[PDB]
Amino acid sequence: MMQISSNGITRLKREEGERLKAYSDSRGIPTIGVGHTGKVDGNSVASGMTITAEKSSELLKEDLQWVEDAISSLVRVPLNQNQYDAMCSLIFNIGKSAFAGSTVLRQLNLKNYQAAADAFLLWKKAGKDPDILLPRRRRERALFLS
Amino acid sequence: MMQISSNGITRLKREEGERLKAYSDSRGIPTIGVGHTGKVDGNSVASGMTITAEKSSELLKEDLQWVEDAISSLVRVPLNQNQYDAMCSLIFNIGKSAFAGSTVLRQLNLKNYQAAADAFLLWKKAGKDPDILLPRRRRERALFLS
Ligand SMILES: [Cl-]
Ligand SMILES: [Cl-]
Ligand SMILES: [Mg+2]
Ligand SMILES: [Sm+3]
Ligand SMILES: [Sm+3]
Ligand SMILES: [Sm+3]
């Protein structure tokens, strides 16, 4: 079945940021790679853990299973690989419940692909800045339409 | 099985912050209550949604089930309610994986309850600030020991 591509992983890494040495996120959660909070090689992520870029990518591919599963369960129209990779990036950011209720999903399921692409641009607010995610949304939209 | 107390809910709300009007968090995820990002009454959280404090408590108890499950799974020794409530607050913050690997847990299962309490104070860093969570940890430690 369809899964994120290597291009999709590179682009997502470059939107999210990669950190190959464990750190504490802004809430206090030990994290490594691209948002990996679970174990690595059977150990809890903790200060002192390092990983390779290969490991970071393989951890991300596994952590995306909920995203891929959301696409499979909710999306009822065909997606090309660029569309799929762009959707993975959006959903990994905004989360499953936000995606489930989104205009992106509604439009895609109507086979209104251009309108679905445009509706990425709605997911632009974070905190006190109403458009800080808009550049990322524009890049994802461009990937979708590629 | 054990469950969080009313006092434990009140204290956790104080630590986390409760927001009765939907907002977009620092990452862009629609959120309401005490960190609830899932659906509310069957619908996605979205701008303009407001909930009551009692609904916020209901959603928090739903969102704490993984925390209570983690304590039940991992801790094999007796806990009084204050200890339990403090642990709920720590874990809800640092996550299950971090707790599973922690000195808090290892010490607790050895029945070194004072050493477990003091190990709360290790979970103090977030982002680039080495001690930003220390005041919260001290309050949780005080609850644990009370
Ligand atoms: Cl692993
Ligand atoms: Cl309500
Ligand atoms: Mg799947
Ligand atoms: Sm490999
Ligand atoms: Sm898997
Ligand atoms: Sm500080």
PDB file of N, CA and C in Angstrom, chain A residues 22-30 37-39 44-45 47 92-95 97-102 123 125-128 132-133, chain B residues 22-30 37-39 44-45 47 92-95 97-102 123 125-128 132-133:
ATOM      1  N   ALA A  22      19.537  13.722  22.062  1.00  0.00           N
ATOM      2  CA  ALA A  22      18.319  13.876  22.809  1.00  0.00           C
ATOM      3  C   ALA A  22      18.261  15.237  23.458  1.00  0.00           C
ATOM      4  N   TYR A  23      17.054  15.767  23.545  1.00  0.00           N
ATOM      5  CA  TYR A  23      16.807  17.079  24.123  1.00  0.00           C
ATOM      6  C   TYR A  23      15.478  17.028  24.794  1.00  0.00           C
ATOM      7  N   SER A  24      15.121  18.044  25.600  1.00  0.00           N
ATOM      8  CA  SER A  24      13.810  18.169  26.194  1.00  0.00           C
ATOM      9  C   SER A  24      13.041  19.188  25.382  1.00  0.00           C
ATOM     10  N   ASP A  25      11.861  18.840  24.900  1.00  0.00           N
ATOM     11  CA  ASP A  25      11.058  19.776  24.112  1.00  0.00           C
ATOM     12  C   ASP A  25      10.557  20.900  25.007  1.00  0.00           C
ATOM     13  N   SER A  26       9.799  21.812  24.410  1.00  0.00           N
ATOM     14  CA  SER A  26       9.387  23.009  25.123  1.00  0.00           C
ATOM     15  C   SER A  26       8.436  22.713  26.252  1.00  0.00           C
ATOM     16  N   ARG A  27       7.840  21.545  26.304  1.00  0.00           N
ATOM     17  CA  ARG A  27       6.988  21.138  27.421  1.00  0.00           C
ATOM     18  C   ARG A  27       7.741  20.329  28.441  1.00  0.00           C
ATOM     19  N   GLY A  28       8.941  19.846  28.162  1.00  0.00           N
ATOM     20  CA  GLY A  28       9.690  19.001  29.070  1.00  0.00           C
ATOM     21  C   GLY A  28       9.818  17.548  28.674  1.00  0.00           C
ATOM     22  N   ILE A  29       9.339  17.153  27.490  1.00  0.00           N
ATOM     23  CA  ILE A  29       9.343  15.735  27.078  1.00  0.00           C
ATOM     24  C   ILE A  29      10.644  15.409  26.394  1.00  0.00           C
ATOM     25  N   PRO A  30      11.370  14.388  26.845  1.00  0.00           N
ATOM     26  CA  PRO A  30      12.608  13.960  26.146  1.00  0.00           C
ATOM     27  C   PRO A  30      12.225  13.528  24.722  1.00  0.00           C
ATOM     28  N   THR A  37       9.482  10.401  20.728  1.00  0.00           N
ATOM     29  CA  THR A  37       9.416  10.437  22.203  1.00  0.00           C
ATOM     30  C   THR A  37       9.460   9.036  22.755  1.00  0.00           C
ATOM     31  N   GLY A  38       9.260   8.035  21.891  1.00  0.00           N
ATOM     32  CA  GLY A  38       9.318   6.679  22.401  1.00  0.00           C
ATOM     33  C   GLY A  38      10.724   6.159  22.595  1.00  0.00           C
ATOM     34  N   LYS A  39      10.793   4.873  22.879  1.00  0.00           N
ATOM     35  CA  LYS A  39      12.111   4.294  23.098  1.00  0.00           C
ATOM     36  C   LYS A  39      12.955   4.241  21.831  1.00  0.00           C
ATOM     37  N   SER A  44      14.673   4.274  27.100  1.00  0.00           N
ATOM     38  CA  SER A  44      13.972   5.561  27.031  1.00  0.00           C
ATOM     39  C   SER A  44      14.918   6.675  26.567  1.00  0.00           C
ATOM     40  N   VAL A  45      14.422   7.509  25.651  1.00  0.00           N
ATOM     41  CA  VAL A  45      15.076   8.723  25.224  1.00  0.00           C
ATOM     42  C   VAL A  45      15.406   9.505  26.492  1.00  0.00           C
ATOM     43  N   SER A  47      18.717  12.385  28.142  1.00  0.00           N
ATOM     44  CA  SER A  47      19.943  13.101  27.945  1.00  0.00           C
ATOM     45  C   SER A  47      21.141  12.177  27.841  1.00  0.00           C
ATOM     46  N   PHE A  92       0.914  15.183  10.309  1.00  0.00           N
ATOM     47  CA  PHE A  92       1.888  15.029  11.383  1.00  0.00           C
ATOM     48  C   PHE A  92       1.958  16.281  12.243  1.00  0.00           C
ATOM     49  N   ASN A  93       1.773  17.430  11.654  1.00  0.00           N
ATOM     50  CA  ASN A  93       1.714  18.706  12.381  1.00  0.00           C
ATOM     51  C   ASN A  93       0.387  18.898  13.125  1.00  0.00           C
ATOM     52  N   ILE A  94      -0.734  18.913  12.418  1.00  0.00           N
ATOM     53  CA  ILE A  94      -1.983  19.398  13.040  1.00  0.00           C
ATOM     54  C   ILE A  94      -2.691  18.336  13.835  1.00  0.00           C
ATOM     55  N   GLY A  95      -2.398  17.059  13.642  1.00  0.00           N
ATOM     56  CA  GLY A  95      -2.943  15.944  14.347  1.00  0.00           C
ATOM     57  C   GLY A  95      -4.162  15.351  13.693  1.00  0.00           C
ATOM     58  N   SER A  97      -7.267  14.524  14.816  1.00  0.00           N
ATOM     59  CA  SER A  97      -8.608  15.070  15.028  1.00  0.00           C
ATOM     60  C   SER A  97      -8.772  16.339  14.228  1.00  0.00           C
ATOM     61  N   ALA A  98      -7.768  17.207  14.177  1.00  0.00           N
ATOM     62  CA  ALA A  98      -7.876  18.423  13.366  1.00  0.00           C
ATOM     63  C   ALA A  98      -8.067  18.061  11.896  1.00  0.00           C
ATOM     64  N   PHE A  99      -7.279  17.088  11.435  1.00  0.00           N
ATOM     65  CA  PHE A  99      -7.441  16.657  10.031  1.00  0.00           C
ATOM     66  C   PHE A  99      -8.810  16.096   9.789  1.00  0.00           C
ATOM     67  N   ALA A 100      -9.346  15.289  10.671  1.00  0.00           N
ATOM     68  CA  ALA A 100     -10.643  14.647  10.479  1.00  0.00           C
ATOM     69  C   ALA A 100     -11.736  15.686  10.292  1.00  0.00           C
ATOM     70  N   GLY A 101     -11.620  16.836  10.954  1.00  0.00           N
ATOM     71  CA  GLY A 101     -12.643  17.831  10.835  1.00  0.00           C
ATOM     72  C   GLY A 101     -12.343  18.897   9.811  1.00  0.00           C
ATOM     73  N   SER A 102     -11.286  18.747   8.995  1.00  0.00           N
ATOM     74  CA  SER A 102     -10.774  19.819   8.133  1.00  0.00           C
ATOM     75  C   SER A 102     -11.500  19.955   6.803  1.00  0.00           C
ATOM     76  N   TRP A 123      -4.463  26.265   7.719  1.00  0.00           N
ATOM     77  CA  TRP A 123      -3.833  25.725   8.922  1.00  0.00           C
ATOM     78  C   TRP A 123      -2.554  26.502   9.228  1.00  0.00           C
ATOM     79  N   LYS A 125      -2.226  29.257  11.847  1.00  0.00           N
ATOM     80  CA  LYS A 125      -2.069  29.904  13.141  1.00  0.00           C
ATOM     81  C   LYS A 125      -1.327  29.017  14.129  1.00  0.00           C
ATOM     82  N   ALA A 126      -0.503  29.651  14.970  1.00  0.00           N
ATOM     83  CA  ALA A 126       0.067  28.938  16.130  1.00  0.00           C
ATOM     84  C   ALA A 126       0.279  29.988  17.213  1.00  0.00           C
ATOM     85  N   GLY A 127      -0.198  29.708  18.413  1.00  0.00           N
ATOM     86  CA  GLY A 127      -0.038  30.709  19.488  1.00  0.00           C
ATOM     87  C   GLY A 127      -0.623  32.037  19.086  1.00  0.00           C
ATOM     88  N   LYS A 128       0.170  33.080  19.336  1.00  0.00           N
ATOM     89  CA  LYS A 128      -0.292  34.455  19.149  1.00  0.00           C
ATOM     90  C   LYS A 128       0.022  34.980  17.765  1.00  0.00           C
ATOM     91  N   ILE A 132       1.918  32.082  11.318  1.00  0.00           N
ATOM     92  CA  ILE A 132       3.314  31.642  11.376  1.00  0.00           C
ATOM     93  C   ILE A 132       3.582  30.328  10.676  1.00  0.00           C
ATOM     94  N   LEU A 133       2.571  29.475  10.501  1.00  0.00           N
ATOM     95  CA  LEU A 133       2.737  28.233   9.773  1.00  0.00           C
ATOM     96  C   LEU A 133       2.418  28.374   8.290  1.00  0.00           C
TER      97      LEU A 133
ATOM     98  N   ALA B  22     -11.280  27.560  22.886  1.00  0.00           N
ATOM     99  CA  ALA B  22     -10.315  26.928  21.977  1.00  0.00           C
ATOM    100  C   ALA B  22      -9.245  27.890  21.544  1.00  0.00           C
ATOM    101  N   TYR B  23      -8.045  27.343  21.377  1.00  0.00           N
ATOM    102  CA  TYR B  23      -6.884  28.091  20.901  1.00  0.00           C
ATOM    103  C   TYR B  23      -6.027  27.169  20.069  1.00  0.00           C
ATOM    104  N   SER B  24      -5.122  27.710  19.305  1.00  0.00           N
ATOM    105  CA  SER B  24      -4.078  26.961  18.605  1.00  0.00           C
ATOM    106  C   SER B  24      -2.809  27.002  19.441  1.00  0.00           C
ATOM    107  N   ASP B  25      -2.284  25.807  19.798  1.00  0.00           N
ATOM    108  CA  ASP B  25      -1.091  25.754  20.634  1.00  0.00           C
ATOM    109  C   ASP B  25       0.144  26.230  19.840  1.00  0.00           C
ATOM    110  N   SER B  26       1.278  26.177  20.516  1.00  0.00           N
ATOM    111  CA  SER B  26       2.517  26.735  19.914  1.00  0.00           C
ATOM    112  C   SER B  26       2.972  25.990  18.688  1.00  0.00           C
ATOM    113  N   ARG B  27       2.483  24.767  18.481  1.00  0.00           N
ATOM    114  CA  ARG B  27       2.763  23.986  17.306  1.00  0.00           C
ATOM    115  C   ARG B  27       1.726  24.114  16.208  1.00  0.00           C
ATOM    116  N   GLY B  28       0.585  24.707  16.490  1.00  0.00           N
ATOM    117  CA  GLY B  28      -0.508  24.806  15.561  1.00  0.00           C
ATOM    118  C   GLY B  28      -1.667  23.862  15.774  1.00  0.00           C
ATOM    119  N   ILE B  29      -1.710  23.150  16.908  1.00  0.00           N
ATOM    120  CA  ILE B  29      -2.765  22.154  17.126  1.00  0.00           C
ATOM    121  C   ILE B  29      -3.911  22.765  17.888  1.00  0.00           C
ATOM    122  N   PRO B  30      -5.131  22.711  17.368  1.00  0.00           N
ATOM    123  CA  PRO B  30      -6.308  23.198  18.131  1.00  0.00           C
ATOM    124  C   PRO B  30      -6.443  22.459  19.456  1.00  0.00           C
ATOM    125  N   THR B  37      -6.845  17.785  22.727  1.00  0.00           N
ATOM    126  CA  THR B  37      -6.738  18.029  21.298  1.00  0.00           C
ATOM    127  C   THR B  37      -7.656  17.098  20.516  1.00  0.00           C
ATOM    128  N   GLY B  38      -8.243  16.110  21.184  1.00  0.00           N
ATOM    129  CA  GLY B  38      -9.130  15.197  20.494  1.00  0.00           C
ATOM    130  C   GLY B  38     -10.470  15.893  20.280  1.00  0.00           C
ATOM    131  N   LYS B  39     -11.409  15.116  19.790  1.00  0.00           N
ATOM    132  CA  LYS B  39     -12.757  15.618  19.589  1.00  0.00           C
ATOM    133  C   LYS B  39     -13.424  15.926  20.954  1.00  0.00           C
ATOM    134  N   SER B  44     -14.420  18.206  16.059  1.00  0.00           N
ATOM    135  CA  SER B  44     -13.061  18.715  16.210  1.00  0.00           C
ATOM    136  C   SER B  44     -13.067  20.033  16.962  1.00  0.00           C
ATOM    137  N   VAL B  45     -12.087  20.256  17.767  1.00  0.00           N
ATOM    138  CA  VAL B  45     -11.907  21.546  18.407  1.00  0.00           C
ATOM    139  C   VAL B  45     -11.667  22.598  17.338  1.00  0.00           C
ATOM    140  N   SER B  47     -12.036  27.209  16.372  1.00  0.00           N
ATOM    141  CA  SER B  47     -12.051  28.566  16.828  1.00  0.00           C
ATOM    142  C   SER B  47     -13.481  28.882  17.241  1.00  0.00           C
ATOM    143  N   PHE B  92       1.767  13.073  33.337  1.00  0.00           N
ATOM    144  CA  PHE B  92       1.000  13.798  32.309  1.00  0.00           C
ATOM    145  C   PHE B  92       1.904  14.785  31.583  1.00  0.00           C
ATOM    146  N   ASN B  93       2.878  15.346  32.300  1.00  0.00           N
ATOM    147  CA  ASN B  93       3.871  16.243  31.704  1.00  0.00           C
ATOM    148  C   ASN B  93       4.944  15.511  30.906  1.00  0.00           C
ATOM    149  N   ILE B  94       5.723  14.616  31.540  1.00  0.00           N
ATOM    150  CA  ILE B  94       6.928  14.079  30.906  1.00  0.00           C
ATOM    151  C   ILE B  94       6.635  12.914  29.970  1.00  0.00           C
ATOM    152  N   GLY B  95       5.505  12.280  30.078  1.00  0.00           N
ATOM    153  CA  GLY B  95       5.094  11.192  29.223  1.00  0.00           C
ATOM    154  C   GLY B  95       5.429   9.819  29.802  1.00  0.00           C
ATOM    155  N   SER B  97       6.885   7.058  28.437  1.00  0.00           N
ATOM    156  CA  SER B  97       8.208   6.518  28.162  1.00  0.00           C
ATOM    157  C   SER B  97       9.252   7.108  29.090  1.00  0.00           C
ATOM    158  N   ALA B  98       9.235   8.408  29.273  1.00  0.00           N
ATOM    159  CA  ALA B  98      10.159   9.061  30.173  1.00  0.00           C
ATOM    160  C   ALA B  98       9.973   8.511  31.600  1.00  0.00           C
ATOM    161  N   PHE B  99       8.720   8.396  32.056  1.00  0.00           N
ATOM    162  CA  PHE B  99       8.498   7.845  33.392  1.00  0.00           C
ATOM    163  C   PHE B  99       9.011   6.405  33.479  1.00  0.00           C
ATOM    164  N   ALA B 100       8.729   5.593  32.478  1.00  0.00           N
ATOM    165  CA  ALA B 100       9.157   4.178  32.537  1.00  0.00           C
ATOM    166  C   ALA B 100      10.653   4.046  32.740  1.00  0.00           C
ATOM    167  N   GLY B 101      11.443   4.957  32.210  1.00  0.00           N
ATOM    168  CA  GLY B 101      12.879   4.898  32.290  1.00  0.00           C
ATOM    169  C   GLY B 101      13.432   5.638  33.486  1.00  0.00           C
ATOM    170  N   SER B 102      12.606   6.211  34.326  1.00  0.00           N
ATOM    171  CA  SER B 102      13.004   7.159  35.316  1.00  0.00           C
ATOM    172  C   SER B 102      13.515   6.572  36.633  1.00  0.00           C
ATOM    173  N   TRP B 123      13.435  16.298  36.738  1.00  0.00           N
ATOM    174  CA  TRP B 123      12.671  16.556  35.524  1.00  0.00           C
ATOM    175  C   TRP B 123      12.346  18.038  35.433  1.00  0.00           C
ATOM    176  N   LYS B 125      14.171  20.455  33.106  1.00  0.00           N
ATOM    177  CA  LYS B 125      14.544  21.182  31.919  1.00  0.00           C
ATOM    178  C   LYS B 125      13.444  21.136  30.887  1.00  0.00           C
ATOM    179  N   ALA B 126      13.314  22.229  30.130  1.00  0.00           N
ATOM    180  CA  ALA B 126      12.468  22.253  28.940  1.00  0.00           C
ATOM    181  C   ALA B 126      13.108  23.215  27.966  1.00  0.00           C
ATOM    182  N   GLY B 127      13.314  22.790  26.709  1.00  0.00           N
ATOM    183  CA  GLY B 127      13.961  23.663  25.743  1.00  0.00           C
ATOM    184  C   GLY B 127      15.357  24.058  26.243  1.00  0.00           C
ATOM    185  N   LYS B 128      15.650  25.321  26.084  1.00  0.00           N
ATOM    186  CA  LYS B 128      16.926  25.906  26.446  1.00  0.00           C
ATOM    187  C   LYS B 128      16.968  26.400  27.877  1.00  0.00           C
ATOM    188  N   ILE B 132      13.276  25.361  34.160  1.00  0.00           N
ATOM    189  CA  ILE B 132      11.982  26.002  34.081  1.00  0.00           C
ATOM    190  C   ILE B 132      10.862  25.195  34.747  1.00  0.00           C
ATOM    191  N   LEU B 133      10.979  23.862  34.776  1.00  0.00           N
ATOM    192  CA  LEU B 133       9.954  23.037  35.417  1.00  0.00           C
ATOM    193  C   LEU B 133      10.228  22.781  36.886  1.00  0.00           C
TER     194      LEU B 133
END
